[PDB]
Structure 1
Amino acid sequence: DWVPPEVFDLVAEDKARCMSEHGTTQAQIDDVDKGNLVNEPSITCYMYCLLEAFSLVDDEANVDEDIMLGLLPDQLQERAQSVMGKCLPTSGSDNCNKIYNLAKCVQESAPDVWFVI
């Protein structure tokens, strides 16, 4: 990752709250970061919950492209713009399913740009 140690202190209160709400284990978060995505609410509602905590998504899992881009380092923004060209709009049966399809889409197309923690 390009995510610096500090960012783990930042999202700590929100990460812990998002894991309680959805029954998420740390092993599930590690599976996402090794490219092993499964359509399970405890992991995909966690992803939605974290994104929602940092205003990357609204109430129907529509992504805010400018906020999502400004979180990435400058170096990846060209490639992230192209990935976002492909993977947006979001799509799915509910918010958790939308973030699932987004994650699978972003990972398939460019592992570097996907922000789960």
Structure 2
Amino acid sequence: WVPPEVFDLVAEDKARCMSEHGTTQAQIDDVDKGNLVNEPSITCYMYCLLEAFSLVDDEANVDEDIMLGLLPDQLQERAQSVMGKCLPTSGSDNCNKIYNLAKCVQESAPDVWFVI
């Protein structure tokens, strides 16, 4: 469902986030396929990229309105349903909060789940 335009929009932040955190594309592909581990090089990548687009703040609180703003209408209240379950975020730090959120969302909605 993700438009191709999104890929060029995120390219610059994706490069920076991967470089900052030691992330490999293979780690991203693995999360993308539903396999999540609590490794900072991928969890901090996910936090990094969300933050770059104002989807989370300095304590990994999710901005639900901006998030709903970005999704298409067909997912718009599946997402509200998933956010009801999975928010607020909780964890030992920003990266771990996003790990637990990722775990929750992908379990709650696997056929829509993805990470760029």
- TM-score > 0.5 by shorter chain: yes
State the alpha-carbon separation in 2 of the partners of residues 116 and 54 from structure 1.
14
> Deviation digits for residues 34-70 of structure 1, max 9, x if unmatched?
0000000000000000000000000000000011111
Query: Under a length normalisation based on structure 1, what TM-score does the superposition of the two structures give?
Result: 0.95
- Please state if 1:42 is matched with 2:19: no
Deviates more, 1:57-66 or 1:105-114: 105-114
Q: Deviations over 1:80-101 (max 9, x none)?
A: 1010000000000000000000
* Percent of matched pairs sharing the same residue: 100
Distance in structure 2 (CA, Å) of the matches to 1:64 and 1:17: 22
Whether the 8 Å contact between 1:18 and 1:46 is mirrored in structure 2 is yes
Instruction: State how far apart, in whole Å, the 1-side matches of 2:89 and 2:65 are.
Output: 15
Aligned to 1:79, the other structure's residue is in SS state helix
Give aligned pairs, total. 116
Where does the alignment leave 5 or more consecutive residues of structure 1 unmatched? none
CA contact (8 A) 2:17 2:45 kept: yes
Deviation (angstroms), 1:115: 5.4
Which aligned segments of 4 or more residues in structure 1 are displaced greater than 3 angstroms?
A: 112-115
- For the pair 1:70 / 2:92, whether they are aligned, the reply is no
The alpha carbon displacement at 1:111 in A equals 2.4
Quickly say closer, same or farther: Cα 1:57–1:102, change in 2 above 3 A.
Answer: same
Cα displacement (A) at 1:116? 2.1
Contact 1:72 1:113 in 2 (8 A): no
